[model samples]
Structure formats: C-alpha cells, structure tokens
Target: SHHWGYGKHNGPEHWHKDFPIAKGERQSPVDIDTHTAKYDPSLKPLSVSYDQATSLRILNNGHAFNVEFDDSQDKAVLKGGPLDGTYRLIQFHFHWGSLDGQGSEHTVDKKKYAAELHLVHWNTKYGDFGKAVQQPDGLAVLGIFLKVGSAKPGLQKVVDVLDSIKTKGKSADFTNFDPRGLLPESLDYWTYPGSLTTPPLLECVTWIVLKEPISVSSEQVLKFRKLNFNGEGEPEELMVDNWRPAQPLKNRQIKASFK
Candidate 1:
C-alpha cells in the first residue's frame, strides 16, 4: 500500500483521497497574515514549566524526527495563554523544507522560516491523550519558528544527536534536556483552531504559534536534511521538504496575544 509520505506521489496534495478530512474545515498549518489577526486582550500569557529530567529519547519515524517524553505523568505542562485547562506535554517534532527560503509549516504574514518546531500537548481534563484527541478542545500545540542565523547553543544538544537517528526507525536515549531552551524570549503568539499537518489530520489542535523566532545556523540546519526517510535496508531518500503547506483560514479568526 502507498503510505502517506512527503514524496510528490503521496504528499499533502493527495492526502484528501486517502484521508477525506484533509479538505475539511479547520485544517492546520495555515498562513498567518499578521496585519489582519485580531489582538485579544483576554488571552493570558502562556505558562510553560518543563522538567529537564523528562527528556526521554529521540527517534526518526521516516517522515520526521521526534523527541519523545515520559508522559505517564505531567512532568511538563502548558497552561494559561488562551488555554483553559493544563495541557500535558506529549512529544515534540520538526518540519523542514529543502532550502533556506522554506521549511516552516505555519507561515507568518506569508513569511517562510527555515524550519518549524511543534510542541505537542494533550489536555488533561479530557481523560487520556487517546480520548482527549477525540474532543475539539483536545490538544494545544506550541509552534515555534526556526530562522537561520548564528549558531544557537540551546539547540545544539539535539543537533548533536541527529547522526544517531540518520535513518528511519532509528532512535537513541535523549536525556537531561529541557525543550524550554528552544523558546523565544517572548511568550506572544497567534492563536487559532487547526488540524494535525500529518495523516488522520485530526482537527483537535488549538494553535499557539510564537511571534518571535529562535535562531539556528545554516550549518545546523544541514544536520536535519542529512537524515533519510527510508530505513537501513531500503533505498535512501533524504528527509527534506517534510512540511505541509499552509491551509485556508475559512471562517475562523486568527487571534493575537500581543499588540
């Protein structure tokens, strides 16, 4: 069977055929046209408390690499900032493009960044992460844009481990690392309702994309592109252009947390 992949044959454009919800309302990775986004004073500043000890492991799952945590308990959580209940951190992943001009899934004012980082969290008030995903208020994902510039010491910890998981299905113990190091100085962001950028395309996500971007060197970005979408035995396919294009806003409003 042709699995949903980032290749031209099975990418986002053709996902609607296999997953009908791809064409549904509230699709994810929408372009944020900043000028028109409403500034909501009611939105609280997002509070993030992450334990460095929660860093579990990092792995390449064919499409992209993910740094998973031990979500058995709420060691790390996101609260406030347009979110009513506490959202437990599940896992975080990245989406990138083949070039410097592209990569990020959710664009800012039509501006593309070198890459995008998704910090996935599931609402605790709704049973478990499994059942939580079924509700419209199930999840809240923090989207942080990664722009290319000077080397970022905070990100180098993860960049150093890319070689271990260079191919699909490969993973290693990634510990003592707190993703809080990756956040920008500002907690300001744009909020909206959207779906997962990948298959199943669940529309349970409430997006909180940061306003400021964190920097990564061009050389550091190269480490991600070096990974292969295929595993050790299969033909090698570089894991580039793994991001889904921005979707339509439809009738939804993109609210801002800052002026």
Candidate 2:
C-alpha cells in the first residue's frame, strides 16, 4: 500500500511525488489576510447543531486523533456561513506542533497558532460524505485555531480519553460529547476553495476558518503529542507537527463573513 505521513522522507514536501494533487492549484492551509478578505454581507451567520448521541468513538489513525460522528442521520449538521447547502458533521480532528508557534495548518497573516481543529462535514445534497468528496462543493470544513493558556473544560472531555487510545489504530467509546462546546464565542470566518491537507488531497473542500481562536493548556498540547503515528508493537513515532505549510492562493479570493 502507498504510505504518507509527517516524516522526513514521507512528509508534505514529498507527498506530491505520489499524490500529484498535492501540488494542485487549489491547495489548503493558506494564510488568511483579514484586511484583504472580501467581506460578504450576503453570508449568513453559521448555524451548528451537534447531538451528543451522534458522537461515536475516538480513534488514533496513526496521524491524528479524530472523534468520529454518526452521520447516518441529520442529527448533527452545519448550515449558513458561506454555505449554500446543509452539511452533515462527520468527524473532527486536530493538527498541532511540538512547539507553541508552529502546529496550526492555517495561519493568520503568517502568524501561527499552537494548534488547529478541523470539523469535517459533507454536503447533505450529495447524500453522504463519500459522494460529496467527488464534487467541487461537496465538503465544508470548519477550522478553529487553538492557543495555549488555560485548559478548556469542554476540551478536557476529549483530552481525558486520549490516554486510552495513545497507540495507532486504538479507539474507545466517546459518546454524548457535543463538539459545539469547543467552538469560540464568535463564528466570524474566512472562506475559500481548497483541498484536503492530506492525501488523496482532493480539492473538494470549501474551507471555513474561524477568526477567533479557542484556548487550551500547554499541558493539554503535550498530551496530544503522546499519540503515536506507529501502531502498537511497532516503533513509537510521536505524532507532532502534523500540519501542512501554507499553499498558494492562486486565483482564489477569500470571502469573510465579517469586516
């Protein structure tokens, strides 16, 4: 099987060799310039409703920890905020760095954050996430920046379960936890067309990155590093700096919901 990871040999720099789309025109993790962002008054405020029961299990996929959601129904969905259709929340994951200034995939005017959270969703018009990935406007990912400071109590629920799935391929029940609790008070955001940060690097995602960053403790960030990219019984490889560098804006124009 083809392999891709955040390693010296298999890192983002070398991903384009196997996944040609890695060098595509509409790539992700771009730097958001608020001053230059076109403020669209037509854009609606983000509407998010996530059901506690829809949160399934947490998994260590040898890359990042993700809390998978049961998208079998419309229980947990996202609408408005530069989106034309309803999108069902599927899974949420994070990308972080070993150091305080370098973990986030996307940056604000070249300023990096301690980490970044991605709430993955797919257009309900496409029926399911599988079908959505093949279309240009099929996916909508909400990106939130994480800063180091006080420990977020809502995030603690997620952090508390990390120990149980420290190794790759490990998972544990993570039910009744609402991801909405992790969002910042404001939903102001920057919107663009981009690809997934990872392979197959599909260019179907409509990126909606929030301007406000949420808080997390330095110790919580260390706990995230505890996850291993290698599976149990294999060599331990720390899962850190699992973020892609900023890509070119190309012909894309970033739209903002706020001025």
Candidate 3:
C-alpha cells in the first residue's frame, strides 16, 4: 500500500487518486441530519457481549491507537440494532483533533465532537473479517462521539498504556478490559450504510452511530495527540486530526432508533 498521511500532499483530498472509492457514493463519516432522520420503531436495542479476557493488545498503527481483540471465537459479539447476524468484535480505535474544539469523524446536524471512537466488527456469516470486508453487508462499525467534561475512569486503563505505545508501530499487552464500559448509557443511535473511513475505503460497513456522546477530560483528550504519526527513527509528527471529513449523504436515508 502507498503511504498516506494527514498531510497536505497525502491527505483526504488526494485519497481519491489512489483509492477511487473515497469519492464513491457510499463513503463514510457522513453528517447526520437529526431533524430529517426517520425514526424507526422496529429497530432492535443493541446487544453487546464482550469477554474481558479477549482483549489482546494495544497498538499504535500510525493512523490511530487501536486495541485489538481475539476474534477467533465468539467471545465478544454484537447483535440487534439494524444488524441481521452476529458481528464479532475485532478492534476499537479513536480519532481526535489537535485541539479540543472538534475532531469527531461523523457529526450531528453538522456539529463536530471532541473525538470519535470506532468499534470495528465483522459479520459472523462472512466467517472472518478479511472475507467480510469484501462483501456488501459484512461489517458494522459503532461510532461514539467524545466530548470534554468529566474524566472517564474506564478510559484511564487505556490511557495508562499510552506511554508504552506512544510511537507509531509500537504495541503493548492490554488485557482484561471490557470495552462496554466505554459506551454511554443510551444505545440510541442512527443507522446508515457506508464505507470504511480509511484506505481501501470498502463500502461494506453498516454504520451504527450513537446519539449520546461520552465524556473525557481536556487532559485525556490531549493524551491522544501526544501519539506520533511517524514511526521510530522517523521525523516526529503529532498524530492529530486523523479523521476523515464528513462525506455527502447522497440518496441514502438515516434511520433513528429513538423518536
């Protein structure tokens, strides 16, 4: 894969040159127009079951810090919502800005949050994540917005390891942490079809974006910016604003689980 960064030369603006799907119809990180979002009474309440031990390691993948999981089994899985089958958890990562004003990938009524969290999962019907990425209805990504307020204790466990994986390509053993603690009280969300927000930009995602935003302190949000986009021995660069801009919502409709 060719190198892509959040720079003027290789940012989202030039992503279409290498990944044509970046400009495709079902691109992700679309703005949710709450006023026009159709409320659906039939949408099921989200069901998330995660085994604390299945959490494997945390890695700084240059783009974002991700906590990878053991998805070989059905230990951690998500059902319900607009999903048809079980979607196994793979990894979860965050996207934030250099400052606190805005950084969320998906916005509400054109408003941006301090950051965004993506819980990536692949449908069990597809067997594995690799196979699922190539299919139309193979992936489901849960997006949670982050706002500056009270400090989140659950997140402190994740932040404690940042010092060990501050540089790109670095990783550290991270286990026994339940990601469920990261979610808000409300599972109320907006559903839509979209693509991965990153390279290859596969249009295989069924987006379930939560309406409620999680809380993180100013200090905690700044810790994310402390990570480097460049790897060891490379010129240092802060990894901030790693989010893709909101794409246009073409002919698709956004369905709300709550009225």
TM-score of each: 0.98, 0.97, 0.98
Name the 10 consecutive residues with the lowest summed lDDT in model 1: 47-56
lDDT of 2 at 66: 94
Q: Give me the candidate number with maximum lDDT.
A: 3
Candidate 3 weakest lDDT stretch, 10 residues? 47-56
lDDT against the true structure, each candidate:
0.91, 0.91, 0.92
Stretches off by above 4 angstroms in model 2 are: 51-53
Clashes (N, CA, C under 3 Å) per candidate: 1, 1, 0
- Cα error, candidate 3, residue 71 (Å): 0.3
- Stretches off by above 4 angstroms in model 1 are none
Which tens-of-lDDT digit does each residue in 1-259 have in candidate 1? 1888988799889999999999989999899988999999999888998863298899999999999888877789999998888898988999988999999999887899999999999999986888888889899999999999988888899999999999999999998888878989998999999988998899999999999999999999999899999999899899999999989889899999988
Model 2 / residue 220 / CA error / Å: 1.1
